[PDB]
Design a protein around this ligand. Structure first.
Ligand SMILES: O=C(O)C1=C[C@@H](OP(=O)(O)O)[C@@H](O)[C@H](O)C1
Length: 427
């Protein structure tokens, strides 16, 4: 199969202009499609997950144009819920941000649409969201395994009292929050218990406000939404650079810099993953903040023991950075790594051991003891962009590393290796 071998990188230094945020991009596209008026999105991410959302909007009849590099999108708002019949099939790859949000949005009014995706997506849970949508009136059918896509959506979400489990994915609550304002009746969303990946809920509320809608957040345990609202185009909107994509470059500097500056995000960013910089600082790196940049400069690197529930995606980057730290690193409260692009706890533990680390794969945590020196390994990537990007960091040592299926980075960052190479120096 395809592979890429990275030669040892002696030092990293430079500036990277980040690709757009996948999280912001897909929310902005769906809201722009539902809104009244024309929205111009700039710095939109061009990656598989965004392309699947764009294809879905095209299939649903939404009109838009894209610039040559696909980062500028002029969307003609539908001025209300999107519709299709005939069990129209929308293929969503392994894009959770599209699968979960569209599963809820397309329950407004009447419809007959099927949502499906790649094999792994048919193994990623969605029952908590379906349960909530049904309590609000939606008719949803599991076409294969109960609690997982594919789904046949026949509409009917009118609002009301809806309970939702927030313990496995914040994407379910995000989906409900963006959908409820357009339902005819008011909706009260009660969180059953714990809420994981909380910062992503803040991203959703931020985007909804940009598109003209606010709701009552009662300490993240209950959300009161007024029905009968309409989203409105914000005019021109700048999509933040991707803070998760930034993690690899800031970590590279913490390991082998040099100073690496990423632009497109800064101290005012809405993304929870900018807090990844705080972790590097705790490990011994120096961080600089600007209005439109974050930079990291090599200091030292010491192991940490931290609850990473607030930054589950960027946290994976700490797992390979831990190979270069002094001491044993423990990342806790990351159970849902198991239900994402791949089971990330199994995958990370398996590949880390291949380069020499002693690793304890806990049920919802991972403990990593680095080897005195790394060895060469051919890294399996599990159709997971982040496994490829995380393991690229192994090359910031005396050994090369071979990454299988390097194009899997295209899920959120097609140009990843060219960008890592841009900051890679021989001297
Ligand atoms: O809503 C979003 O943009 C995302 C929320 C997170 O999922 P969970 O809430 O399942 O942790 C994150 O892991 C995913 O990559 C993107």
């Amino acid at each position: 199969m395809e592979s890429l071998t990275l030669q040892p990188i002696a030092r990293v230094d430079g500036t990277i202009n980040l690709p757009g945020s996948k999280s912001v991009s897909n929310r902005a596209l769906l809201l722009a499609a539902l809104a009244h008026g024309k929205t111009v999105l700039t710095n939109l991410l061009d990656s598989d997950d965004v392309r699947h959302m764009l294809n879905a909007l095209t299939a649903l009849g939404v009109s838009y144009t894209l610039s040559a590099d696909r980062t500028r999108c002029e969307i003609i708002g539908n001025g209300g819920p999107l519709h299709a019949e005939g069990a129209l099939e929308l293929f969503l790859g392994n894009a959770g941000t599209a699968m979960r949000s569209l599963a809820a949005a397309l329950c407004l009014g009447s419809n007959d649409i099927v949502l499906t995706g790649e094999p792994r997506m048919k193994e990623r849970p969605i029952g908590h969201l379906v349960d909530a949508l049904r309590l609000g009136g939606a008719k949803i059918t599991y076409l294969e395994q109960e609690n997982y896509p594919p789904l046949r959506l026949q509409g009917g979400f009118t609002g009301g009292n809806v309970d939702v489990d927030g313990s496995v994915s914040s994407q379910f609550l995000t989906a409900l929050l963006m959908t409820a304002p357009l339902a005819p009746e008011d909706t009260v969303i009660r969180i059953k218990g714990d809420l994981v990946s909380k910062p992503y809920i803040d991203i959703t509320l931020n985007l909804m406000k940009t598109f003209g809608v606010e709701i009552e957040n009662q300490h993240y345990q209950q959300f009161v939404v007024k029905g009968g609202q309409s989203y409105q185009s914000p005019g021109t909107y700048l999509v933040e650079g991707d803070a998760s994509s930034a993690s690899y470059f800031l970590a590279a500097a913490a390991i082998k810099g040099g100073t690496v500056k990423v632009t497109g995000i800064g101290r005012n960013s809405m993304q929870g993953d900018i807090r990844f910089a705080d972790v590097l600082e705790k490990m011994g790196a120096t961080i600089c903040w600007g209005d439109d940049y974050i930079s990291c400069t090599r200091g030292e690197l010491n192991a940490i023991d931290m609850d990473m529930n607030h930054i589950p995606d960027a946290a994976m980057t700490i797992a390979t950075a831990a190979l270069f730290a002094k001491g044993t690193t423990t990342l806790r409260n990351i159970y849902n790594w198991r239900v994402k692009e791949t089971d990330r706890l199994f995958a990370m533990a398996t590949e880390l051991r291949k380069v020499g680390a002693e690793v304890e794969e806990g049920h919802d945590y991972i403990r990593i003891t680095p080897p005195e020196k790394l060895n060469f390994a051919e890294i399996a990537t599990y159709n997971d962009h982040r496994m490829a990007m995380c393991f690229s960091l192994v090359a910031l040592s005396d050994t090369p590393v071979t990454i299988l299926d390097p194009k899997c980075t295209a899920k959120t960052f097609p140009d990843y290796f060219e960008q890592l190479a841009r900051i890679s120096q021989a001297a």
